[PDB]
Amino acid sequence: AFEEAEKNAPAIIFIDELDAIAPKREKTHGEVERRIVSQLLTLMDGLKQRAHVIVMAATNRPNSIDPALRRFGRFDREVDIGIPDATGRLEILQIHTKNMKLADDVDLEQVANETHGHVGADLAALCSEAALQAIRKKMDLIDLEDETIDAEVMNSLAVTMDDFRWALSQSNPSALRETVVEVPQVTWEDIGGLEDVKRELQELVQYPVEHPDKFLKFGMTPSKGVLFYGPPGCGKTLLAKAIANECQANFISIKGPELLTMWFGESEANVREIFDKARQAAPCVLFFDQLDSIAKARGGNIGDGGGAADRVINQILTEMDGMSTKKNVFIIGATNRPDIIDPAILRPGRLDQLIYIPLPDEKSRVAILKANLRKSPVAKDVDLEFLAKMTNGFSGADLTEICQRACKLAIRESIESEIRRERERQPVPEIRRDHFEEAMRFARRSVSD
Amino acid sequence: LSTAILKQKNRPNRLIVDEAINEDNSVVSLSQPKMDELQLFRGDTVLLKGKKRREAVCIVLSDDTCSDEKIRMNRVVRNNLRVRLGDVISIQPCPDVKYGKRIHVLPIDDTVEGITGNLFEVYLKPYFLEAYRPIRKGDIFLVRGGMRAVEFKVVETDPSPYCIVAPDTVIHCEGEPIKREDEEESLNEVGYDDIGGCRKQLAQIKEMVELPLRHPALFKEIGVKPPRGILLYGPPGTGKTLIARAVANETGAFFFLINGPEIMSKLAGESESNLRKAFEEAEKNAPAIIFIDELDAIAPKREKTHGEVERRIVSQLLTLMDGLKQRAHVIVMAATNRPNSIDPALRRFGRFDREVDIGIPDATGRLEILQIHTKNMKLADDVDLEQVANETHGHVGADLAALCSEAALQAIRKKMDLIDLEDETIDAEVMNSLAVTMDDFRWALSQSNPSALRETVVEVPQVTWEDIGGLEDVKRELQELVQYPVEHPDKFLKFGMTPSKGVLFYGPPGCGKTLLAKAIANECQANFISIKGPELLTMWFGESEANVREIFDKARQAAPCVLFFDQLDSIAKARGGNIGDGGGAADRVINQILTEMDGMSTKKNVFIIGATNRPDIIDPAILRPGRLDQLIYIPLPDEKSRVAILKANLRKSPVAKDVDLEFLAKMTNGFSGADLTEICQRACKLAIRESIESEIRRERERQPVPEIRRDHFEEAMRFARRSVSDNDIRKYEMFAQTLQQSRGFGSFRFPS
Amino acid sequence: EIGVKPPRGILLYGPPGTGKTLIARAVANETGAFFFLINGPEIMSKLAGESESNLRKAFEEAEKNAPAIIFIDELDAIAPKREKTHGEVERRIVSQLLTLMDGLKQRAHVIVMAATNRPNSIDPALRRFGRFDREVDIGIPDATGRLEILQIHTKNMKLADDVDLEQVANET
Amino acid sequence: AFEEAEKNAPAIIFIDELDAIAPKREKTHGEVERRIVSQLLTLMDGLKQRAHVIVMAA
């Protein structure tokens, strides 16, 4: 190959997936692979004498490349093809839609804005999905088994903004395909109370991203961390669900111990990779539910155990430190046992902001009861203010349990009425006061003093 | 809208298949008004389109008995078109059919036996003389006459593939007989109709593999390429390989199959060469589909793969699917159980651009699967596949095939009285009388159990809601708990509240918690996974939480599923209570359980039931609603309950009428149910001792106790002891009273 | 007539010595089928691509001697869970076994029988319908059964008149 | 090794430190240990081959 490139000079050599042929020589356990890497190094050296050959390569695991091949005279100049910006995604969409028969109402600026972690494969996928939607709308007009298609349908067939909205609904970044979780639809209206917490969350998200120049000008680095701590059932994971559904930032929801693995060195690799793909999809929110699993106070269990949890927390802290201010990765942790968190997590620069999610007060309890029963048929004579007065220390989970108990009692009554109807043949419009009283006689307080 | 591609729209060419009364193999009958609609003259040849890419030519006929919407068509033409009765077939007039010059005929081997004369002399010669009948390749027809009519297969046609029969045309029967097994294989071909459930998934798959090839003008005019890569993922047995087989059998594209480990080779560069040969062969052959079964075998993550061969194979695949030289009209399909094991660069738009989730079907889907699998089986009238679809909860489609096969084996076992294994052949009477009844399906249902749950299968001792005495309120709560969300989700949607799905039984030892779990396991209509407390924990790092994750995942797949933790306090304990325990492996297990039961993922019909003696040590985040919503206290039975317990234990046992169980209950104060069962067992032991002693004394004299009497209970009670002391009762009462006082109100009533 | 293909995969499980190998051999001899034995560890090969190559060659031979009974002794060693094991070779072995047993191309007329002391260590996908239809538990025999076993091993050896195999049949 | 030994009709097979070759199955996690134990078992099940092959362990 190199001789052929020299013979027809000036020439360009392209080595697609360089990391396939050029791994680290110390790591490689084969003799033929080491011969390949050394032959590559030799030909790179001989290249400089070669008058007019330029060698170009591509890889998406650059660190896997042998360290010798990134020195002077061998791949000495490197180009970083990063994730595009909003203008970049607009250009990519304009490139990919130029042949497509776009309608008039379609605007590519909104599409470019809504796609956050997309890289260009994702945007091409988006345009292809929009086209499939536009075709699907016509499957009523012309069927598949049909031999031909009416030319009128072909003329009418075009891509509208509704197709792009559908594609945007389905589209998710290729990077985040692993970490996607089906999250229940939770809107800020579904949460009762915590209004100050909601506003603080929205601000702490959008301020460092939309306006970083002012954060520079005043000389203050933005916070990249929040910790939610509070009693169980008070709205931490609920706020995480709300942020995932509503806020226009990529969301990575991870359980605590999903990262940990028995094999040596794997756990830290998982931590590095998850922070990495939070970086690739930024602006992103990285959520550690039950943070008291992976970030536990170092040294208390130092004597007993394999000792890998220490390396896991060190890798987390190293990723939190190495993360740049300009990169917009927000890290949120939830813990209902805040003491057993490592203090080093709580030091400045990492999970700085501590948001205490208290037991709801009376107004917040009214808001919670109204939120749970917003979609539910509720009798008018049910007085939610009295329920909030009577449930003085109840957590939001307890109030949801009360509403679900009332639902069960009403369902039981309606089932009995139906059984009566089928028995005589051979009821319950909504949830009433008596159901709520029968439910409240069971109501218990989840959080002790 | 999503499944708009699957619709038929009642096209006038599509016609319902119906039986033909008098038509022969090369002719069919259609009603005269329909032939008026179709501009079809009598006696014309027509080209009929059928399922699985089969075309046949028959002579149209006018029938007054035939209906307009039905097409009358005999066994031969249907078995040619691979169509069952009631299916829809397309009809079009055959254009410029040219009289066949030479045609080759080969008969079926099972029919040729027992015939003396030459087949062409006897059957082919008169049938093909003055016939003027069109025929096509791949056609199997039966000609009447002779001692046995012989079925004939149209192997070769010149001109290919369809041609009319002329007297000057030469008819020769020379060649090998066509194997009947091969004809059966041709008939038993999987098609898009053989996939049940997964209508939306099949719609997307058809939109990718069928629509571009059928109507490339659509994508040419809309000015963008169709997606060209499908990754079918799902749990094992949901029908990914089946969808691949259907795609292969029912597409015009060249289909090239790759199985994962087949690529592997010792020689360096040989596996990459096999992959390149596969893709090159697909490229040479016009539109093509490549299916890579078990992709995760040959496409692991390059970061996590140690071997150089596997990393080079992944890189070769990446470069082939999307490289500097693009594919030309090649679709790559892949099926994998573990999609997250696939290398992340394969999961972008260039290579595997849409991933299709072949998930566990719902009730309607598994009913459709049952119909698909029982179409061939001859079923009685009592059989109700809808009931079987309801009773099977976590089955994925391979389990339903197993259920149907097991029902048929049970039907055959019912007939081994008459049938002989020793006899070589079976009489016609029993074989004709052989059929599958609903009892056979009930037996199969009893044995059936999802394959995903085979790991977590434990025998239960066949307890019933009758065997438990007392606890009426608890019994009703548990029955409602498990039955409402599965039987009447309509009510929950109408009231707009998610069900409560957590129960914790705490109470003194012996009082009926594991018994209630056995009753739920046998009685409730949902899958049951029984977990002992500490069977999840492992010495390996991070594997205990992995076991927790996989058991909760098994529960989610087999939903509705009841997950019972026999001793919750072992696995669930307050975090930070211990000094050692690894690096807090116990606390990590607690956190994993907390996240599984109420986390950011959406909820399924998984009911978690925990039983504990010591509910005070349990982590309070476990006891909050949303995780173990209700704390049910199973106390020491009271006197009515003790009567009920004694009646339940002695219900199957012959007992004397003099025995006053009411008095036994009145005396046994503070006794648990286990103690009363011990009293009954002791009475049984004393009775058995007396019985054996009587037997021995009879054996002595030669060389009594039909039922347990009152003296036996007197002795057994004299031995009996109370198991739960007053101190234990006080501790449990303390927990119960703390929970009650947590409310702060004796009772609650709304203002007037 | 009834319309169902017979179950073609059998897994025998029970402690060592319960006779799973000899049960398989007896079934192979008494029926008109060639007995082709596969042992787990001997299939396990060192280089990449020889293990599942040996599996392919074994299935191909057993198809050549159609009809035949393939007995895979120690299936737990050859086919552990793909999620559990870290080594690639074991995962590729399990995938090849799945493909050979049930795939877009399936076995036509062979019955596959595997023996394992512990069935839970088997990868679950093997325990599916299409592949290992039925699991037969060969356990410790009861009194009558061990009476039969004692008679069988004692047929060749001469026995005195005082010998009563019921004594040992109850005792063991 | 068993093949070469069984080629010789009269044979005394001496294994030194069998315990290292075959420790207990449940004692060690290593799957290659289970495979080595099972291979030893299948070889020793039919070592006799109706022949003078005998095996000694140390």
Ligand SMILES: Nc1ncnc2c1ncn2[C@@H]1O[C@H](COP(=O)(O)OP(=O)(O)OP(=O)(O)O)[C@@H](O)[C@H]1O
């Ligand atoms: N402020 C609230 N508004 C509405 N619903 C609420 C609120 N707080 C709690 N809930 C209800 O209670 C549950 C919220 O539990 P959530 O996951 O938020 O708890 P958590 O604080 O993460 O607790 P844990 O530490 O136990 O995981 C949901 O069922 C939700 O409907």
Ligand SMILES: Nc1ncnc2c1ncn2[C@@H]1O[C@H](COP(=O)(O)OP(=O)(O)OP(=O)(O)O)[C@@H](O)[C@H]1O
């Ligand atoms: N959706 C389905 N509809 C009808 N039959 C099904 C379906 N899913 C599975 N089956 C039955 O199960 C048999 C085997 O299933 P199949 O091989 O397709 O499973 P799978 O999940 O694709 O597995 P694998 O990918 O490991 O091959 C099929 O031959 C068919 O009889």
Ligand SMILES: Nc1ncnc2c1ncn2[C@@H]1O[C@H](COP(=O)(O)OP(=O)(O)OP(=O)(O)O)[C@@H](O)[C@H]1O
């Ligand atoms: N109400 C009851 N009706 C019938 N049998 C009962 C009842 N209560 C207890 N038993 C008897 O108790 C024995 C088993 O008790 P069970 O397993 O229910 O106890 P448990 O509450 O789970 O106790 P543990 O704390 O020891 O786990 C059986 O013999 C069963 O018959």
Ligand SMILES: Nc1ncnc2c1ncn2[C@@H]1O[C@H](COP(=O)(O)OP(=O)(O)O)[C@@H](O)[C@H]1O
């Ligand atoms: N009916 C029987 N059940 C179990 N084992 C038997 C029986 N009859 C003989 N055996 C003895 O079992 C010995 C070995 O059993 P084996 O084939 O190793 O079973 P497994 O492989 O399941 O341990 C044989 O040498 C045979 O002598």
Ligand SMILES: [Mg+2]
């Ligand atoms: Mg939470």
Ligand SMILES: [Mg+2]
């Ligand atoms: Mg498959």
Ligand SMILES: [Mg+2]
């Ligand atoms: Mg118990």
